[PDB]
Design a protein around this ligand. Sequence first.
Ligand code: HEC
Length: 100
Amino acid sequence: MADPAAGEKVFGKCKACHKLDGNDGVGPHLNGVVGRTVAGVDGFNYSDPMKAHGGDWTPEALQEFLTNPKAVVKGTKMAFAGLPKIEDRANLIAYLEGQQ
Ligand code: HEC
């Protein structure tokens, strides 16, 4: 299931650290992350294994990192446990395509 309205309720788990619309808080601003370069917001300083990772945030790279972030990038400052169900990750990735 890839629904952007159910992805807005799943993004309430992200809202306290991350704000979509230009504003960088505890994490960076997430407007248009689907396809965006790893360590790409010039303005937010990232972790050293996040800067050394490379490539882009594709829908499989976002599904692996949102399943467990500190197992995928060993030494990221993202203090989030994980989304185990596919519908929560796929609904959220449809909302992050909706806000490009
Ligand atoms: C605060 C406790 C966070 C929560 C809750 C979530 N994330 Fe976060 N995110 C946070 C930080 C501090 C960072 C930077 C990590 C680093 O190593 O520098 C991040 C990063 C992401 C990223 C990468 C973005 C990029 O521009 O490279 C993504 C894709 C990301 N976080 C997504 C995300 C989502 C969708 C969350 C809710 C399910 C989520 N984060 C929660 C801090 C926190």
